[PDB]
Write a protein that binds this ligand. Structure first.
Ligand code: CLA
Ligand code: CLA
Ligand code: CLA
Ligand code: CLA
Ligand code: CLA
Ligand code: CLA
Ligand code: KC2
Ligand SMILES: CC1=C(C#C/C(C)=C/C=C/C(C)=C/C=C/C=C(C)/C=C/C=C(\C)C#CC2=C(C)C[C@@H](O)CC2(C)C)C(C)(C)C[C@H](O)C1
Ligand SMILES: CC1=C(C#C/C(C)=C/C=C/C(C)=C/C=C/C=C(C)/C=C/C=C(\C)C#CC2=C(C)C[C@@H](O)CC2(C)C)C(C)(C)C[C@H](O)C1
Ligand SMILES: CC1=C(C#C\C(C)=C/C=C/C(C)=C/C=C/C=C(C)/C=C/C=C(\C)C#CC2=C(C)C[C@@H](O)CC2(C)C)C(C)(C)C[C@H](O)C1
Ligand SMILES: CC1=C(C#C/C(C)=C/C=C/C(C)=C/C=C/C=C(C)/C=C/C=C(C)/C=C/C2=C(C)CCCC2(C)C)C(C)(C)C[C@H](O)C1
Ligand code: SF4
Lengths: 175, 154, 161, 42, 174, 178, 172, 60, 74
């Protein structure tokens, strides 16, 4: 079916990709390559899944090497700067090596590579095709859900100044 | 042979162009009629322009009310500028450019709102008729009709 | 300030020039009755002298030891209105004038008898040309880059060397 | 307007005199209403 | 070839009778200037917003939600607007109505292309108009009630500007 | 053979009722010495500027932007009281609108070089309100009549503001004879 | 055939799409008079110098070399605080860099901008080479505009770009 | 060169050197300068035509 | 005054240079007289023909430039 019944189905969304319900009202797929859009969507969603898990874990668990802030967003501002640069450059090395040093929309998919498939499947998990399709669908939906969830958790922790589970209990309202 | 202000360069001995494109009838909402590349009015016609204007007006609403809103003990909110947002890891540049750098409403004393007229930036409307009438006024109201009437009645 | 000169608004000899001019006009004013048209004309001249000296003293002009404003023309922006900006105004007008004249010459070659156009101006066409001069730098530069302003040396007459 | 009279009016000396008087009138009225402009005011 | 509503005026050429509420009423020829699809979308949007505003004025006269009386006090009708601009309610209202109106803009431009009826968002989650004739009856009723509520809400807010009573309070006090 | 507007003069040549607002009114023979396309483009430009200008001279009294600098009801005071950088931005933007809207053909020798370029047709129809054929001639007639009325009205308002030192509406409400 | 940057003008004759930073933009017709390959080499060099300059107008506000830690964060003061010896060494290094450019431009027939500095071989992949070839000219033009802006703003404000932003000193 | 053609003059001493004239007559007899060329600009002596050899005229 | 008199001096030097350089470079021939080198450095004229040729030699350019040299040293 179509997500928006009062508009026609976007012609570049053919339903082959997992998660396609026909939702492109602005028409982003009419201008940009769909492989770049899928790589960006999966990367944003994966970063948000790790961010949701980190925001839930850094509220309660703090390694003794670091010194926890009152909220997981303030936890960024108490880390040494060299450590943040270390994480940033390690992520840059991963981004360089996982893409074959091909980091731009003009050469990322020049060798016919699949969007979001960087060949990282260590623990088996990828032999059944019928399970591969369903796990693709689960990955894209949980990625979008973790995008919206991470946006909510970060903005409400910035607003209230307390953590997420610290806000689920003793819940206050704007007054 | 050469009419004044004719605007034909060959009539004035001016270097001509030769190539004159035909004028298409396709129209864009915020653009102009004229010769364009093939594919141009189909990607960037009225639909695209209206969609981008809608998206810009939508995104204006968080941008106009830009700031760090912090809850206090009584549940009230204190809004403070992004200019005090400090970063740990760019050396001696603790203060950094933010979204309020691109949209500095408070620098000009402009009370921005999500529809861009604020409480302290309201459009000022005042009635110029001063609470009197068109004719037969006795007071601080001498209209043009009263001047005409006094000119006849003298 | 610049070059050891003093601003005119604090120079005592500038004030001495103003006072000398005012007394020189006032001694002429003394010989006429109040209300007579020469008296009004002289008082208007006094008013213009006072207004001119007041305006010159508040403009940041530099005065020498003579008592007259001295212009600075080394390119500094603090006196950029003394030579640079009026000159550009001339540069606006003069580049206009030659261009429209050049345009008329290029028109005049295309007529049946050019010399009659040279002595008897085609007034609508000339008014069109003098209207065209408002964008003269860009038009002249495009005329230059398209090879329509500069002609090669092999098409120009020269004397035997 | 007779076309021969207009063509005589379009001659170089008449148009020269009229244009230079017109320019002089611009300079004269500019200096009458805005006198003593030694400088471009800042 | 004459207007049915105004018998001494011609039938407007952009009007045909297909749309609900068409009685040939366009004396000033506004449909000759604008597109009839844009005009019908504007009429439906003005009417639906005015129905919601009329029903809101009636119900806010009738009763109030829990807790609104503390923040607002004895301020009613358009007088709450500025207060609820200082509070966060109307910023949320504008944010979500702008989010809806982005897709409304895309739908209006799609209608101006000509693949979609004006005001047809296909929003019938209760499936009221199964057979086409009841669909026509609700279309006529919707456009008539929308125009009636446009006039009603105009009267209500200008009567509030005159007396400061409210549409039911003005009925209950001369 | 005679002009309709001025019945004691002969009909001016090149005027044949084709353009909107053509009543044969050209006593000084401007169309006999200059081309009608440039004259029509200039007339429409002066008229449109005066439409915006008359609407501004009436609206600015009733409605102002917030701020002290925009609180002058009389428009000749609002010319000076408005911030200078904003008006220089207005000048530059008008220059850019002239530059791109005429498609780099700005003079009396290159505007209308394209045979498809029509006097007053810059291609400006943002809401496409001209998509109707039999309305078109009446629309151009209404536009030129509004422009002419606005030119005469805006001239009268500016010089009456000069005489009276009063904004127009309150000058009509607080009238003082000369 | 019409220009793609200015759709109502004809396409300029002496620029073609094979040049990396082509957009069909020559309203003044510079390519019609001057040597196009010279103009390409000059654009590339102006853009590269402005890339280094746009990074270096901003970078000392983040941090300075320990020997230059006492130097001002305003670039127009730190230009003067450097002695003639350091600027002479910088000029000598720039001259060493320009000797290769002199030889290539006045005596060679290489591609525009090609001084033979490709140690990482990042232009080996054809699509990657095309993307980098266009992107160098784009970021060079952007840095030309940005460095022009930063220099005249530093003239007006006597502080660096980040410093001028965070104090919000936007009016002269 | 032929009748009616526009030609440029390569005679160094000529008033119309590197200027354009129109060929008025080409004489067929054994004349040293058989090409009569008429010019739109008059010389210092007021003449506007001159005879040239074949090598002193080049077609434009 | 020093500014004005040095720019007047520059005017006089440039004008004397104009006369002298124009005399030296047109000494071999001009459009009015392309065979001037056949007539030597000094001769009165080339007659009233071709519009008139008074003071056409380079010696005459010396003669005209002497007054400007006297003006410049003055
Ligand atoms: C080759 C492997 C390697 C080695 C030897 C180190 C060594 C170090 N790391 Mg480290 N790191 C690595 C890989 C490595 N890292 C990777 C792959 C990651 C990402 C998962 C990290 C993430 C990381 C974080 C998040 C932090 C460190 C920190 C540290 C420092 C701890 C001691 C300290 O604080 O005193 C040194 C104290 C100083 C003030 C000196 C400044 C730090 C120097 C300049 C860093 C030098 C690191 C060195 C170049 C190796 C980096 C490898 C690179 C690929 C990341 C030490 C220099 C901590 C740190 O630097 O705290 C300050 C810290 O917070 N690292
Ligand atoms: C005789 C040689 C000479 C020349 C050619 C110049 C030329 C210039 N001087 Mg200058 N100057 C000179 C001697 C000279 N000066 C001397 C002897 C002094 C000492 C008294 C000065 C003191 C001086 C100051 C104090 C300043 C100048 C400035 C300028 C520049 C302003 C022009 C402009 O708008 O460009 C700039 C605009 C563009 C290039 C393009 C805009 C379009 C210009 C390049 C000004 C400047 O900007 O310095 C560079 C300035 O502030 N000059
Ligand atoms: C169409 C106008 C025009 C143009 C564009 C030029 C262009 C030029 N002249 Mg020339 N000139 C002209 C008219 C013109 N001339 C006339 C009428 C005279 C006789 C007085 C001269 C006498 C003259 C001399 C003696 C010299 C030049 C020189 C020059 C060159 C340098 C610029 C200069 O010194 O200007 C200065 C111009 C003048 C002093 C005279 C200008 C006279 C008026 C103001 C211009 C005519 C405007 C015209 C009436 C407009 C009518 C058009 C209208 C119908 C639309 C340049 C090639 C100089 C040179 O060789 O430099 C390389 C030089 O030494 N010219
Ligand atoms: C924008 C409108 C608005 C505003 C300003 C408030 C504001 C408030 N509500 Mg409220 N509320 C609203 C809409 C609103 N509510 C709606 C739509 C509902 C659903 C019917 C409720 C249901 C509700 C309940 C059930 C309660 C509040 C309560 C409160 C107060 C918290 C103390 C606070 C003043 C609490 C209170 O003490 O109010 C009496 C409370 O118990 N509200
Ligand atoms: C007088 C009220 C009224 C009526 C008769 C209709 C009738 C219609 N609407 Mg509609 N609409 C209304 C008000 C109304 N609307 C308002 C106020 C809004 C804004 C929220 C909308 C928004 C809307 C959308 C977005 C869409 C419709 C559509 C439709 C059509 C499908 C049938 C349907 O769902 O109607 C059933 C309606 C009723 C049975 C009305 C019941 C009235 C309730 C009981 C009163 C509640 C009052 C309450 C206290 C406040 C039909 C012509 C759809 C369409 O045209 O495409 C199929 C469509 O996409 N409407
Ligand atoms: C000839 C046109 C014109 C000009 C030169 C001015 C000039 C001015 N107006 Mg103004 N104004 C105009 C028309 C004009 N107005 C019209 C038509 C309206 C009614 C909507 C207004 C309403 C208005 C208000 C409410 C205020 C001013 C104010 C001002 C002053 C400050 C500038 C400012 O903030 O602009 C503000 C300008 C606007 C709010 C609207 C301008 C709309 C113009 C006409 C643009 C539309 C056409 C545009 C060129 C696009 C066409 C392109 C096409 C040709 C291709 C300044 C003296 C302010 C002031 O000083 O108060 C006294 C102020 O508060 N104006
Ligand atoms: C992420 C990219 C992007 C954004 C965010 C964005 C936003 C907005 C907004 C937002 C408020 C408006 C109002 C607006 C309007 C117009 N845009 Mg759009 N635009 C983007 C991309 C492009 C490109 C690549 C082109 C283009 C164009 C036009 C034209 C054409 C006029 C005409 O054709 O006459 C108009 C009117 C085409 C053009 O001609 O640009 C000169 C063109 O090539 N746009 N655009
Ligand atoms: C369609 C959609 C849904 C829907 C939902 C929608 C919201 C259903 C509701 C539609 C409602 C909002 C209709 C409201 C109409 C207002 C009437 C015409 C006006 C009164 C104004 C006049 C008489 C007056 C006034 C007067 C004057 C001026 C001032 C006063 O002093 C006095 C007075 C008051 C007499 C549903 C759930 C149905 C399901 C469907 O599947 C999908
Ligand atoms: C083209 C079209 C566009 C449209 C558009 C534009 C914006 C059209 C709207 C235009 C406005 C600007 C027309 C202005 C008229 C002003 C004059 C008539 C007032 C004259 C009063 C004078 C005569 C009188 C006066 C008097 C003076 C003398 C003395 C005083 O004591 C009194 C008084 C003041 C009474 C849109 C945007 C829709 C898009 C579409 O796709 C295409
Ligand atoms: C050669 C290549 C490699 C190399 C690498 C080298 C190091 C290449 C480095 C290239 C670097 C220098 C690129 C830098 C670009 C910066 C530009 C785009 C920006 C200016 C910003 C503007 C927009 C602005 C600003 C604005 C100013 C005006 C005003 C403010 O109010 C606002 C704001 C701040 C927005 C190596 C050596 C590895 C080898 C390899 O084999 C090949
Ligand atoms: C929120 C807010 C505010 C506000 C506001 C609001 C909510 C404003 C709302 C205004 C509205 C809804 C006005 C409606 C006007 C209707 C008219 C004139 C109808 C005329 C009909 C006629 C002439 C004829 C009808 C006819 C009849 C009789 C029968 C035949 C047909 C026809 C000929 C058509 C403010 C401004 C106070 C500011 C405050 O800080 C915040
Ligand atoms: S008047 Fe002239 S041409 Fe005649 S003889 Fe004397 S110098 Fe020669």
């Amino acid at each position: 079916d179509n997500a928006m019944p009062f508009l026609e189905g976007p012609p570049k969304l053919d339903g082959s990709l997992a998660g396609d319900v026909g939702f492109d009202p602005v028409g982003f797929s009419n201008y940009f390559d769909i492989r770049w859009l899928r790589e960006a969507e999966l990367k944003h969603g994966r970063v948000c899944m790790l961010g949701v898990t980190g925001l839930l874990v850094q509220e309660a668990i703090c390694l003794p090497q670091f010194a926890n802030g009152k909220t997981p967003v303030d936890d960024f501002f108490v880390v040494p700067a060299a450590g943040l640069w270390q994480v940033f450059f390690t992520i840059g090395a991963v981004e360089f090596f996982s893409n074959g040093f091909k980091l731009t929309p003009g050469d990322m998919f020049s060798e016919g590579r699949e969007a979001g498939d960087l060949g990282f499947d260590p623990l088996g998990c990828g032999k059944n095709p019928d399970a591969l399709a369903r796990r693709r669908l689960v990955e894209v939906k949980n990625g979008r859900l973790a995008m919206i969830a991470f946006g909510g958790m970060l903005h409400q922790q910035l607003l209230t100044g307390q953590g997420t589970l610290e806000q689920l209990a003793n819940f206050k309202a704007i007054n | 042979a050469a009419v004044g202000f004719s605007g034909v360069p060959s009539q004035f001995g001016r270097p001509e162009s030769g190539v004159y494109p035909a004028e298409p009838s396709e129209q864009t909402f915020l653009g102009m009629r004229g010769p364009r590349a093939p594919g141009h009015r189909e990607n960037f016609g009225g639909k695209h322009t209206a969609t981008m204007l809608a998206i810009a007006a939508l995104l204006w609403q968080p941008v106009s009310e830009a700031g760090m809103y912090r809850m206090q003990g009584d549940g009230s909110l204190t809004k403070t500028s992004f200019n005090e947002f400090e970063v740990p890891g760019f050396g001696n540049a603790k203060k950094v450019p933010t979204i309020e750098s691109l949209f500095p409403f408070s620098s000009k004393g402009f009370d921005a709102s999500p529809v861009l007229f604020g409480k302290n930036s309201m459009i000022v409307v005042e009635d110029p008729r001063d609470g009197c009438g068109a004719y037969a006024n006795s007071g601080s109201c001498h209209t043009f009709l009263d001047e005409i009437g006094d000119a006849l009645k003298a | 300030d610049v070059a050891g000169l003093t601003p005119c608004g604090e120079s005592k000899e500038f004030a001495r020039r103003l006072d000398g001019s005012v007394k020189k006009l006032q001694t002429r004013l003394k010989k006429y009755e109040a209300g007579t048209p020469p008296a009004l004309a002289l008082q208007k001249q006094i008013d213009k002298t006072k207004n001119r000296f007041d305006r010159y003293g508040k403009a940041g002009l530099l005065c020498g030891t003579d008592g007259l404003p001295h212009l600075i023309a080394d390119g500094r922006w603090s006196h950029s209105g003394e030579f640079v900006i009026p000159g550009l105004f001339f540069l606006y007008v003069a580049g206009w004038i030659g261009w429209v004249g050049r345009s008329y010459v290029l028109f005049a070659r295309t007529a049946d008898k050019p010399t009659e156009k040279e002595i008897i101006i085609d007034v609508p066409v000339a008014l069109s040309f003098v209207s065209t001069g408002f964008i003269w730098p860009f038009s002249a530069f495009k005329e230059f880059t398209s090879g329509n302003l500069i002609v090669p040396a092999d098409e120009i007459t020269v004397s035997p060397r | 307007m007779d076309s021969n009279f207009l063509k005589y009016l379009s001659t170089a000396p008449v148009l020269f005199t009229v244009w230079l008087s017109f320019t002089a009138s611009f300079i004269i009225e500019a200096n009458r209403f805005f006198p003593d402009m030694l400088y471009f005011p800042m | 070839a004459m207007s049915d509503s105004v018998p001494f005026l011609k039938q407007p050429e952009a009007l045909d009778g297909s749309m609900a509420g068409d009685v040939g009423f366009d004396p000033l020829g506004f449909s000759s200037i604008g597109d009839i699809n844009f005009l019908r979308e504007a009429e439906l949007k003005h009417g639906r917003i005015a129905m919601l505003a009329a029903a809101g004025s009636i119900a806010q006269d009738i009763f109030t939600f829990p807790g609104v009386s503390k923040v607002v006090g004895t301020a009613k009708m358009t007088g709450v607007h500025d207060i609820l601009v200082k509070q966060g309610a109307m910023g949320q209202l504008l944010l979500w109505l702008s989010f809806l109106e982005v897709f409304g803009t895309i739908a209006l431009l799609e209608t101006l292309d000509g693949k979609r009826a004006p005001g047809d968002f296909k929003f019938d989650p209760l499936n009221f108009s199964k057979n086409p004739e009841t669909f026509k009856r609700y279309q006529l009723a919707e456009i008539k009630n929308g125009r009636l509520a446009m006039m009603g809400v105009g009267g209500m807010v200008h009567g509030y500007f005159i007396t400061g009573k409210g549409p039911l309070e003005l009925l209950g006090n001369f | 053979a005679k002009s309709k507007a001025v019945p004691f003069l002969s009909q001016p040549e090149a005027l044949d009722g084709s353009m909107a607002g053509d009543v044969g009114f050209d006593p000084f023979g401007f169309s006999s010495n200059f081309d009608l396309k440039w004259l029509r483009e200039a007339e429409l430009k002066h008229g449109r500027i005066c439409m915006l200008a008359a609407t501004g001279c009436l609206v600015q009294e009733v409605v102002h932007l917030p701020g002290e600098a925009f609180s002058q009801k009389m428009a000749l005071n609002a010319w000076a009281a408005a911030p200078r950088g904003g008006m220089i931005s207005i000048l530059v933007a008008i220059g850019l609108i002239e530059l791109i809207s005429n498609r780099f053909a700005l003079t009396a020798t290159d505007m209308f070089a394209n045979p498809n370029r029509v006097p007053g047709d810059l291609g400006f129809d943002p809401l496409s309100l001209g998509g109707n054929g039999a309305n078109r001639a009446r629309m151009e007639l209404a536009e030129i009549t509004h422009g002419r009325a606005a030119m005469m009205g805006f001239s009268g308002m500016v010089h009456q503001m000069l005489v009276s030192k009063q904004a127009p509406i309150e000058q009509l409400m607080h009238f003082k004879a000369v | 055939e019409m220009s793609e940057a200015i759709p109502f003008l004809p396409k300029p004759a002496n620029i073609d799409a094979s040049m990396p930073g082509y957009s069909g933009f020559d309203p003044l017709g510079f390519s019609d008079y001057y040597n196009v390959k010279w103009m390409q080499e000059a654009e590339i060099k102006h853009g590269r110098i402005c890339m280094l300059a746009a990074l270096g107008m901003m970078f000392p506000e983040f941090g300075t070399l320990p020997q230059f830690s006492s130097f001002s964060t305003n670039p127009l003061e730190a230009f003067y605080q450097v002695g003639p010896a350091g600027w002479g060494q910088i000029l000598l290094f720039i001259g060493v860099l320009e000797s290769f450019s002199y030889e290539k431009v006045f005596y060679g027939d290489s591609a525009p901008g090609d001084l033979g500095f490709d140690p990482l071989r990042m232009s080996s992949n054809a699509a990657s080479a095309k993307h980098y070839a266009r992107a160098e000219v784009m970021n060079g033009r952007l840095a030309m505009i940005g460095f022009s802006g930063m220099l005249h703003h530093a003239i007006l404000t006597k502080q660096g770009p980040i410093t001028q932003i965070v104090e919000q000193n936007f009016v002269p | 060169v032929k009748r009616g053609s526009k030609v440029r003059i390569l005679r160094k001493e000529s008033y119309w050197y590197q200027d354009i004239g129109t060929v008025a007559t080409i004489d067929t007899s054994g004349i040293r300068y058989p090409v009569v060329v008429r010019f739109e600009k008059v010389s210092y002596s007021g003449v506007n035509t001159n005879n040239f050899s074949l090598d002193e005229v080049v077609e434009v | 005054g020093d500014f004005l008199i040095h720019h007047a001096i520059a005017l006089a030097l440039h004008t004397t240079t104009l006369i002298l350089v124009k005399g030296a470079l047109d000494a071999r021939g001009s459009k009015l007289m392309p065979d001037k080198k056949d007539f030597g450095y000094s001769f009165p004229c080339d007659g009233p023909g071709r519009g008139g040729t008074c003071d056409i030699s380079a010696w005459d350019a010396f003669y005209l430039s002497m007054f400007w040299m006297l003006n410049t040293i003055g």
